[model samples]
Every structure is written in structure tokens, then in C-alpha cells.
Target: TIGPVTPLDASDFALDIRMPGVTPKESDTYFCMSMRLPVDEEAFVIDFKPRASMDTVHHMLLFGCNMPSSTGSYWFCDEGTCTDKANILYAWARNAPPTRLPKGVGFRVGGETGSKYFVLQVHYGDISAFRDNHKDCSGVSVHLTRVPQPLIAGMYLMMSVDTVIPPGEKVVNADISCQYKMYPMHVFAYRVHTHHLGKVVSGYRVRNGQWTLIGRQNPQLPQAFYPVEHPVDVTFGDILAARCVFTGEGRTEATHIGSDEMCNLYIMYYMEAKYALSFMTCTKNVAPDMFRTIPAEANIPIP
Candidate 1:
């Protein structure tokens, strides 16, 4: 019931806007971020939430505000994965024309193909929350393109399906499927490359007909998550079921997409665990191999 307003870590967000005569122009068509309010201000809302673990697959953009003409609301967030992407704050205003960028409110990060090291948790809505420190009811402006890309871990496209068996087992496992969008407060990370198909790799949430049991990836040792500050908020139409049971022996489908082998079930995730787990130092191309499935340019092992 209205939960999500404590996440802002794109290093803190405060670019303010810079375009010094074009001192740097090899590819700089136009960049914006201007906030100078204190007039007849109605609303200049902007709020980003992301310490990563909302399930990681972001998309946002709201340019030149004061808009609201026929089909406004430049952009907001949380609408993950294809389909009009309607979630720009319930579609409010758009068509800002009073002189163009009047009251000031601009946003344009990237998703689908836009590009940027996704990480947001910002706020600048309505301007009436804190007006003290020299003008703080609302003031947020960021404008800087080209200098992101560092959130690498398969770049969030997500791919890690391993359920190896080698030291005794149960069996009846191997029907992998990873298609997420269950965005309530997303935080997904599943990696099981058995040293022995020990037992337990559960993840079921089938909704409507019920098949609950929403967590389990106990591959015997190191693999404990759901803790990016503790998040498991799922709501907004859920459906992210997975199965990898093998208490005995025999179960290998790791990951094979082309001919398809990551079998059954699909979707319900939105990339949040603070943008998909990190402490930096990700180059694990691997001196190891368990989850298999490679094509188009295989050979990843970059420790």
C-alpha cells in the first residue's frame, strides 16, 4: 500500500546541468537537468528508487517538464518489460508548453536500449517537502551522458542456471526457466552449480491455482541471498516459478536456450537487489564451469 521511497544512490545525483560552449563534443547533441523553482510552482516531481533489489531491469525518462497536453507525463519508472510501459506515476501530465521547459523537470536515463549504469533513488516531487537549506522544497537536476557502464555481471540481462550433480542425489530435476518481473520490491539471484546435487533448489510461486514456496537455493554451501537490506516485496501480478529438484542423481539441463532446455515457467522480476548484487570486482569469467549454454560468441571466463 504505497511503499517505495527510500532509495537514492546513483552516487547521490547532483549534476545540475553542464554544457560549457561544447568543450566536449564528439557526441553531445543535447543533455538536460535544470531545477530552479520558487515561483507559482505546481509540481515538478521526480523520484527514483534503487539501492538495487527491486529486481533489476529498469526504464525511465521524463524530459522538459511542465507538460500535460493530450498525452503527457514524460516518464517515471516501475513498469518493467514491454507493453506501453505505462507506469509514469499513473500517467499524469505532459505537453509542457508555457515557453517550453518552464517550471523545470527533466529526466532521461535509459532502458530497452537507451543505456546508462542503472542506479536510481531520487526525489523531487511537488516541491513542498523541505524548503530550508537555501531552497529545498524540491531541487534535483542531473545531466551527464557517457560515463556509466561499470555494473557488469552479465550486465543484468541475467544468465546463471546451474544444477550440477556429482556426489550422490535424489533426481527429478532439470527444467530450468528464468523470466522475471515480479516487482513488489524485487531481489533475484539464483546460482547453483553443485559439487554434488545435494538437495534443494526450490522456487515456486504459481499463483491462482497455488503452488507456493517462494525461496530456496541451498546448493550445500555458499549461496545465501534475499538480503540486499532485506527485500521480498512481490505484487503487481506475479509469476516467477522455477524447479531444480535432485536429491539423488541425474539432472543436467544447466542452461541451453537456442534449442531450449531452460524449460517451463516464465517471468516476474524487475532487477533491484541494488541493481543485482555488487561490491565490485566482477570478472568471474571463471576457471570453473557448471551451468552450460553458449552461442553467438561463446567463451566467458574473465576472472
Candidate 2:
């Protein structure tokens, strides 16, 4: 069994800062940050915290995010029959009764204050294995003994530049980013979407020391999730890149990942398995830029 809980904050992990200063011409500075957490031995619970300055009109944005594996809703085709069903195990938490777990294992990631809605991408193993055996197991309903709001507390993340009013501006826009962690490897064909004034929205990966573009969405539609143009096999250790830029500045109301007259980066994923379960949060060689080396057997001790 694992040990008891130890309190944590934003300083535990490493972060890269790249923010543009006040200038006449447009210049962009980027921030590179990553969360390196311990993998669960067997259905472990870990908490994640955001690292941003307390006083803020501007703070680090958890932007283009995705994981290699996940557990969630899936589409099934049994003997040439096709139907999509929600994977009950995706919501599996300890003490959550009637949770249909695959491989008799369940991993759960907690929540945060800013990100209320978490994106659950179904892409992984054992989805069909659980479905085949438990198909007859009907009338089993599941509910959280408690609700899980904001799903960034215990997962790998991506940060964004989430501020509108430039420096010296009085009003501090909320700059609340619509955060989502994608199932990187599971995405086969993805689509892009955004609103007006969206200068750039890109999704790329690092291959052989070169940046490769998987998808690009400059001008996007208000409704509908845009699938990525060139689908590729995205995995851990692959440096991923994405951006949603705005050239002109004005009074902004709701500026989120998928908001009106704002910026967004939405891409659907397809996996080899019929269902997309979990994305890789392993932190195993996920590009030296996204994570730092911690001793394999070392961990933070609670005193």
C-alpha cells in the first residue's frame, strides 16, 4: 500500500518562462512547464495544483493539453454491429460502487477550481474486455459519492498565455483558459475550431529534432469540432506545439479555448482500439523540455 498524503504546491515541478514584454511591434514569448507526478501502483489518488502568480491579470495558461492514455466513452462494433457506449470505468474512483473496471484496475485524477469541466477521451486497453464480460450486467448505476470538478489536480498539463489586456491595463481579465488534456497517441484524425480574431491555432510535434505540424486552424467555425488535417501517431517523448493568437486587441468578454470571438484548439482523436481510454501520463522521457529527472525510487516524504 502507498503512504499517506503529503501537501503540495506549484514549486515541486520545473517550468520554462517565455513571455513577450511591452514593445511596439508584435513579439511572442513562450512559457514551457510540466508536471512530473508519480505513477499509481494500483488506483492511487494524487492532487495537482496550478503554478501562477497570486496577483494576476495574467497567469500561466493550461493550454493545448493531451495524454497518451485515458479511460472513457467508447464506440463498439461487435460482429459488424456498431454502437458507442460510455465506459463506466472512466469515472471510477475509490469507493465508487458498481464501477465496471477493466483489468480490475482504476486510476483517477482529481479536480481544480478554474477548470470545472474535464475532457474525458476514451482511448486505451480493456474497454472491450470489460464490455464483453459485463454486457449482461445491466441495471448497474454509478454516481460519485462526491463530485470531481476541475480535472487538473492529478494529471500532466500544458500552460498557455491567458491574458488579454496588455501590461499597464487596469482591468484584469479573468483569462480563464478552457483546459483539456488530449489522448495524444489515440488521436487519428482531428479537427480544429475557433472564433473571429483568431490569428493562429497550431498543433505540432517534435520528430527527429524538427517541429512537425499535425494540424492548423487559423480561421475556424463557431460550432462543430474541427478534426486535425494530417493525423499522425502522437506519443510521449514527442514535443507537441500549439498556439491560438489574436492580432487585434479590444474589449473581450469570454476568451477561452472554445469561446466566442476568441481562440480555440479542438481536435478529435481516433485510436487503434475501438474505444479511447487513457492518454500517457507516464512522464517517462516525455521530451526533456516537458519534465525533469526525479530519482526512480525517490518521493516526497510527509513529516
Candidate 3:
């Protein structure tokens, strides 16, 4: 499979998330490094590609931050995530594929928002595999363009972190919901995620007492951003929600988030203005009320 490459445009350059020859002593090791862009002018991020395999790097996330966790080159991500303000620019797992932003839309960076700082977090699962003569550099390759793009894109994550899946049940669901009170944003694509238990994952927009499907799919497939079947404008006071359907029949003990399970949906949206939204997350407990009913177009399936 093809990996990251240099940007084609002469004005575009690569901002990489490379590890500095560090060794991991334990399993589930997470390392983070920060980069600050030039403050003089704004740039647009148009593409992303991961640098490592699933065996070496379990996953990676690129976070746009007002201020990163450390000024030092690299550190263990115990403080966890960006320090001041954070928004998920991109995430990769399950040997997921690369993402190229749609034409005319790009993430606004280094402008008036001053959202120039970023942190690259990489998780190394089963460190034993890498210790056998593999001193490696595992991270992401980001493409940024100095040429201005009109529409500004950003990621809004819907999460169900507080969940409990009882054993012996064949079907289990974890739902998440929240209200939006920000500028109007149009969703262009979505990325879904769940652990092995996940069977189907669905996301929706709740407005004017109606449930409109954003997208739905089997999360087991490649965890790349799939274009939305129907474009949606999430306006003020609109409720954003999602659910993860999990199969819990094989497990002997209960499954919980973090260690055992996870449910998340990332929405890639663009605003009318030059800058994107500042806030990143909207997570609630659960929902199935009218969530069961939605348009057929929402049934975005796996390939």
C-alpha cells in the first residue's frame, strides 16, 4: 500500500509527526509531540497520511491547540491531549486510509484565530513487537497550502465515553447526543469508530423535532472519512447525536469504555467564513427515542 508523499503544489509543504528514536518499555505506550506554525500568515491544511503500520502504531490523532502541552520536543501524553483549547484535525486507526480534503475546503491554520499550535499523539500497542531491533519513527504526514482556500473545515467529535456493556447480550448499544449553539456549519463527511464489539454505528442531526440522518455504517471497515450522502446544515440549538451497536455475546465479563470499548463519530464540516469552529466536542449520555426512525438515505453502508 502507498504511504505519505510530498505535496504536489509548489506552495504546499509537509508538516510531519515523526517520532525521535524513542523506545517503548510497556504496552499501550502513547507519545506526543508539538509543532507551532509560522504566525505571520495563515495556511490551509488539505491532506493527511499516516506513516506507520497498524502493528507498530495502533493509531494517531492530530489536534489543533491554542497552546500545546509542552515546549519540549517529545513527552509521554499523561497530561493527555492539548492543554488550553483543542480540536481534532484528524484521527487514524484500524490501518485506516489517508484523507484528502474536498476541493475548496481546508482547515484554516495560523491566521487570526492564532490556532497555530498542534500536537501529534501516537499510540504504540504491544511494544514488545517493536523492541526486537525496531527503533522507529511512527507518525503522520500533513500537507498544508499557503494558497488560501475559501471554505474552512474542522472536526467535531461525538463521543460515548461513559458506557457499560453487559456480557451475554448479543446486541448492545451506546448512544451520544448534544445540542449545538454555534455558527451554521455544513457537514461534508463523517468518520466512525468503535472497538471489536461494534456492529453498526450511526449519526444524526436533530432539529425542529425531527431526526435527520447524517450517516451510518459498520465500523469494522476502514476508518476513513466517508462523504455524507446528504449535506446537512447544523444550525443553532440543533441537537447532534449518534449511537454504536455492539455485540457482547462472546465476552465473559462486562465491557466498559477506555480499556474495553469505545464509541466515537467525527464530523468534518466547513463554515462560510475564513475560520472554522473553535469548540470540538458535544457528548451526552444516550438516546434512542426517535433515533430509531430516520430517512433511508441515512443508511450509508459499508463497501
Candidate 4:
């Protein structure tokens, strides 16, 4: 029930995503806003809190971009695709609680003493119940530390798009797996998401032919990112996988809309400064055209 709060420290600032004075309609609506970092200084995010209630907001994802695809402050572009490079900084859904970064850890914004442009995309689910009287000011408030942290935290989204839940099936499973490369990552948190049909969602890590449970939770909860009780290490060649079980009275189709169904997993990790890439995703067996359009690199076996 708690919303966002302002930081009292002079060194801290808040970056918010909200409808200043606009009202949402009945259908799924998307709004994007642009922001910039300090001209010559980098900002590190330390904390994040949801400002919107579950009734007015379905989910909100923050994207770091070199330049936004839209020219206006707010626009409707809910076609389920990113407008730029699509670097996800943070994602919030349901009644998820605020996320506080681990000690001495923060997500670095901007780079090389230059200001960077970022975008906030908010998904407002059917809000027609309010008509014109319901003006929503829902978004996320990010807390940033004045000084940057030694290591940069990153978020990786692992999901399967080709999922179809059978009608009246007691258990329908959707699987997503990936192989790592190039860097060693310290996974500190995880989160899972699905529509109403989801039952149990879990993840695992396979190394040396053995499986280690990473994290699992029921998707119907707050859908907040849960910090791993003990952080786990993932290196190059490690296999990361996730499975979602669903049960429904009728068939559920896979789609981006919340009313339909989805199978998604999010992994949060940190890497050393030597790593050039801040974010990465493994969709080897998930992308719609992965099998249709064959490539030389697609020879790797996928399970």
C-alpha cells in the first residue's frame, strides 16, 4: 500500500515517471518520456520505489537509450517493441515493493562524463472504469547516490515468447534456457512474471551437468524482484534456465497484453568495471524467428 517517497539527503535526487495531468483510457496504453543525466557527471541509482497503484498501472519498464525514438514527451506506442537499443534499467509490476541495491552497488547512468538520454515506458491497463475523473500519476521514483559505485549492476530479461497453455490442463509448462559468454556475472536477484494463468515459476543454473536452483515464486504475488538469499556466480559457458507452469480452464494465448498470457524471467547481476557491456540477454531458443531464419551460429544445441 506504500507509494514513493522523496529523499531528504541533499545529495540524492528522484527520477519519476508519471502522467502529469493526463488520464488513461480503457485499453492498454503506453506512454514514454525522455530524461537526461548530469552534463558531465554520472548518476548511480541506489533505490527504486513504485509510485503507482496496482489498480491504475499494470507495469512500468525503464529503458536507457542514446536517443529516444519519439519526439514528444508522451506518446502511445504500445506495440511491444523498443524504440532504441532497449537497455532495461528497471522493471516494476503488480504491487511489488521498492528495490534497494546491495551495499556499494548501483546502476551507473550516463558514461564517460557525458550526459545520456533515457526513456520511461509505462503500461496502463484498462482504466475505463474512471472515465475522465481518473487522472493517474503513477510511475517509479528512483533514488540516486551522488557518487558512483565501484561496480555497475545490470538486469537481464530471460523469457519465452512461444507459449501456448492448453485448455483445462492441470499443468502446462513453458521453458526458457540460455548459455553465457564473455563475462563472469554475480547474480544477486531474480523475478518472474506471467498473466492470470500462471501457477509456479522457477529458475535454475546448470554447470558441469548438475542443476542448482536459483529462485522460484508464484507469479500471482506482488511480482516484485526478490533478492537472492545468497548471491550466486555465473560464468561463461554456464547454462541458465527457467520454467513456468500454468493451469487454466480455457486455452491461453501468448501475447504482450497482460490480459492474455506471458512467460518471463528477469535476472539481476553485477560485473566488474572491465566488462564493456552493461546488459545482456539470451534468447537462443525463444525469439520468434530463431528457427525460421537459420544462421551459422544457430548450430548450438538448445534444450
Candidate 5:
């Protein structure tokens, strides 16, 4: 029902994550698996390609964990309650293709002594037609760099979940934003996500009372992390903001299911040194007719 998996280069370092070829029982079954770094050095991920096809994989989320959340080979993570230390590293869905990081930039993993473990959660969409004997070897092939770069790359998520879309509305919008903290950063890539009703997702920066476009794309596309074309630098006092547009026939509430909806913005950036934290988010709304706003001092100073 889906096309062939994207192939990785022969020389690129790869991590193959596979399911045990078990048949899912329901139309919307969530599965989770674990992996660990074979060595101690910091693994810099340069590219990521999903092995599973779009027919079976609704979405995939990779999390870096301090420890395994479940003892079993797979666990249900529909509520995202599997672990507290699970930090998202990369996500794929909607027929997203192989994503290559910007030149010299790569996601850092497995450098620390205790943070070598990771979890891969795959959301299985309608599998009702598959026979019990059928099995699927679904996973991702992660490509890494031979040598680490001077700067460390990071992924930050901004989301809005408390809003509702009324029936018959053709265009519904939600906005969320945050300010930079600690060190300066250069945003190199961005990707947005929304459910079936999602139309557009855009990110911007406000400085000196003028808004500069960071990037914008249709979430209905492959949902892959696209390069920003022109990377922008952000520092203290720079307000980063994002918006999502949707159109639907009935009321839709914010939730984390393929049948429901989600308004999420993923920003990819890099800094000279690793910070204690990397993600920033804001979800305040002034009114139904107004967009979400970021406070002037919303950033938390790095200690």
C-alpha cells in the first residue's frame, strides 16, 4: 500500500530500529521500542529515513531517555505516559522522506554516560485488513557523521492545545511563541504538524517591532524537517512565534491522535555549547479573536 523505503548511503553510519514483525490488533495501535548506543562517544545524526511505509505508520517519534520506560519489547504510549525523561529528538509522519541535517549540523546523542538510551514510538494507523500471519519490519535508518561538528544541534517544540475549532469554520488559527535565553542560536530548519484539518504552519521572529519570516510550510506535506533556506540568528529579546491554520466540518479539540488534531511547531537550531535545556514554549491567549503572545522576559536564564 506504500512505496519502497528510502535507502541510506553505504558509508553513512546507521542505526536500524525494527519491530519484531508482530501483527497489531487495532486500527490505531501505538507501539514503543528501545535502543542504546553501542559506544560512548557522542553520536551526531546527519540524516534520518523511515523504514516503514505510510500505509502502516501514521507517525513516528524518537525520544532520548535516561532509562527504558518499559521492560517489554513494546508498550502502549497513547497518553505519552511511558517516561518522564523522554526528550524528543526526531519525528516523522505523513509520508516524510529522508531528512538530511544542514551541513556541519547534527543532533547530539549518547555523549553522556547515562543518556545513551532511546525510545522509538510508532503510531499504527488502520491495520484492520492485515492477516494475523502478516508481520511488519518497521523502523528508521539513522545516518550519522564520522566526526562531530563544532556546534551542537537541538530541536524545540512549541504547541497550543487548549483551543477549540467550531463546526463549519473554514479557517481556524492558533498562535504560540517564546523568547530566547542564555546563549545565542542559529535556526537552520523547521517542520510543522497538524491532523487531518491542518492547512498551514508558519514561524516568525519579532525584533525592533518588525516581524521577520523564519519559515512556513503546509503541514499536509510530507511533514519532514525542511531547511529554512536562510538561517536566522536569535538572541536575548528576540521573540520566536508560530501559527497553525486548520479547516474542518465539525468541532475539533486539541489531542494526540491521528483522528484528532494537534498544533505543533518544531524548530531546529544549534549553539556553540550544550545548554542544560533546549526547548521553549508559550500557549497563552489574550482572546478568541487575538493571537497568542510571548512575554518580553519569558526566557529562562541559563544557570
Candidate 6:
């Protein structure tokens, strides 16, 4: 019900990009599963259904990579899943519904002479209920077609790794930004992610000193790829910015981003280019004081 109205055809194939039912040892366990695609021809990803529940999964990210970190079917992912370049293809969280690309758009993958792989990374939060005997297999159910689509799709990630919240501060800002230097990309939808402290996650495109809102949402809501009513485009030298707002009122101890907290934004875009961009991420750490320098006139979330 979340996809196109048309029926399936013979060229379609379903692939379960999932884990191997491995038992989790502790909370906050991040596991990754990788699959090697056929080298014979290219295919387009059409639709996806996230295969996990909010009670089990904190979040999930699907990355198109040149090579996976581990050759094993699934492995403990402490840091990253890609060995070389990585590009996020899709994501799911917060019980969001399934997603499908537009009629002529699809994530083009496989069939290249060099090689490509799909890596599914899942973040499991608070697995205490599962206990020792339970094994978990969670990921995404993908629908693909051997035929090519007119447009290629990808996700541009913006995130801050240093999400450290000082004790007793009411609100803290985690900002990530960079100048986009590539072919034009038109954003159709966007998403934000944060822990319990997140209030508002906002993203903007700054061009010629004018700020254009890409998307903003209360990240605590169902983390879905909300469609943009009016699509926006960003091009070479355009600055992309995102701010994830959080509060620390109830906690006595400082919270860090490398743990239970996160500040991330993903822009889902489409382009007519031959191949999607690689290494298209802006990961930065702006001190809380620096965020305070931003004025209220900007209309974005304040520090």
C-alpha cells in the first residue's frame, strides 16, 4: 500500500537484505549484513519494506559500497560497514512505512565492471528483553527490477559525531554542514534522527546568502522520509546545513553522541547523472558555543 498503484511484472525480484538470526549479547548492538550483487547486468531498486519493529531496532541504514568490511554474511559493526567508498541508498526507523521511488526513478546498482555490494546496518537498542536464548534477524525486504529506470536516486547524509551534551544544559545544538560540489541534485524527501532529547531537526540550503528550508521535523515522530511539497535543488558551491536540537534537563550526567544519542539528517534525491555520487557526506563537530553565534533571524533552529 505504500508503493505505486501498478502491479508487479516478470522482471521484478525480491531480495531480503537481512541478518542471519544472530543472538545479541548486549544492548546497543550494531550489526551489519552484506550481499554481493550479480556482475552480469545492472538493476534498479524499486521498493522496500523495513523488516524490524521499534521494540527491537533503533535504526537501519542501507549503503551501496565498493566492498564490505567483512566477507562474512553478518558481523558486529562497531564503526563502519564499508571498506572503501560508501553511499546511503535507503533507511528506515521509528516504525515508518514502506517507500517506493517515483515512476521513472530507481536506485541503479550492480552490473558495473568494477563491482558493488549492498550493506545493511542495523542498530539494536536495549536488547535486554530478548535475553540470551533469542536470536534476531532484522533488515529490509527489497524489490528490484532488471530493467533500468530513467533517473538514479541516492541519499546524502549529514551528521555530527560529537554530540556531547553538558550536564544540566536545557538545550544543545549539533550542527553539520558542507558545500555541495557536484552535479545538480533535486531533493524529493528528507529524514531526521535523534534520541529522546531531540526537539527539532532542521535542514537548509544556503545559496547566495539566502537560506532555503529543505526540511524540518520533530525527530521524535515516526522517522519517515516525508515528501517535500515543493522540491528544492542544490548545486555546485551551495552550502548544506543541518541542526539537531536536544535538551539535557533531566539527566545528571553528560550524554555523548557516540552512544545513545545521535544527530543525523538524510536527503533523498534524484539525478540524471550516469552514476550517483560517492562519499557524499558532511560529518562535522561544531562546538555548542559556536552554534550560539547563529542568530535568530536565520529562522532555523537556534542553539
lDDT tens string, model 5, 1-303?
322222345434667777667577788888888777665776666667777765777877777766767767777776452465565667777565435666676667776533476688887888756466777777776676546566777766777776567667777667676665657778887877887777777777777655667777777776667777788887888777767777665655433322367887778788774452345455543233323343322221111
Of 5 and 6, the candidate ahead on lDDT is 6
> Would you give me the overall lDDT of model 6?
0.75
Question: Candidate 4 has what TM-score?
Answer: 0.71
Better of 2 and 6 by TM-score: 6
Candidate 6: stretches off by over 4 Å: 1-12, 24-29, 52-59, 111-115, 122-137, 161-167, 194-198, 220-224, 248-262, 274-279, 283-303
Residue-by-residue lDDT tens digits, candidate 6, 102-159: 6678787877532378899888888776478977778887777877676777778888
Clash count for candidate 1 is: 47
Sequence-dependent TM-score of model 5: 0.72
Query: Which residue pairs collide, candidate 3?
Result: none
Q: Model 1: runs farther than 4 Å from truth?
A: 1-112, 115-171, 175-243, 246-303
lDDT of 2 by residue, 1-303 (tens): 212222234222212221221111111222222221232221222221332222221212222122312222211211111122111112211111111222212223222211111222111111222233221101111112122222211222123334353433332211112212344443332333344445445555555455555555444332222334444655645555444444335643434433334443333333332223333222112343421221211121111
Q: What is the lDDT ranking, best to worst?
A: 3, 6, 4, 5, 2, 1
Please give me the total number of clashing residue pairs in predicted model 2: 34
In model 3, the worst 10-residue window by lDDT is 294-303
Q: Could you give candidate 4's per-residue lDDT for residues 1-303 as a string of tens digits? A: 332334548777776556555566656788776666543367777777767656767878776767677667576656432455666677777656546677877787776632276577777777656477766666667777677677778877776666676567767666677777757878888877888777877766667655566778888875667778888888888777777777756655433322378777778888875673467775545323222332222222212
lDDT of 3 by residue, 1-303 (tens): 323334556888777667776676788888888877744488877788777755767877788887787777788998766778677787777555545666787788887774777788888877665476566677777788888777789778888877788888887767788788888888878988888888878888899878777888788886667778667899988888887778788789999964578888888898875435744686675445756664544444444
**Per-model root-mean-square deviation over C-alphas:** 20.3, 22.2, 5.1, 7.6, 7.7, 5.7
lDDT of 4 at 127: 66
Candidate 1 achieves a global lDDT of: 0.28
Clash count, one per candidate: 47, 34, 0, 0, 0, 0
Whole-model lDDT values for every prediction:
0.28, 0.29, 0.76, 0.67, 0.67, 0.75
Show model 5 residue runs off by greater than 4 Å: 1-14, 26-28, 39-41, 53-55, 67-69, 79-82, 111-115, 126-130, 144-147, 161-172, 195-198, 218-222, 246-249, 252-262, 274-278, 283-303
**Over the full model, what C-alpha lDDT does candidate 2 score relative to the true structure?**
0.29
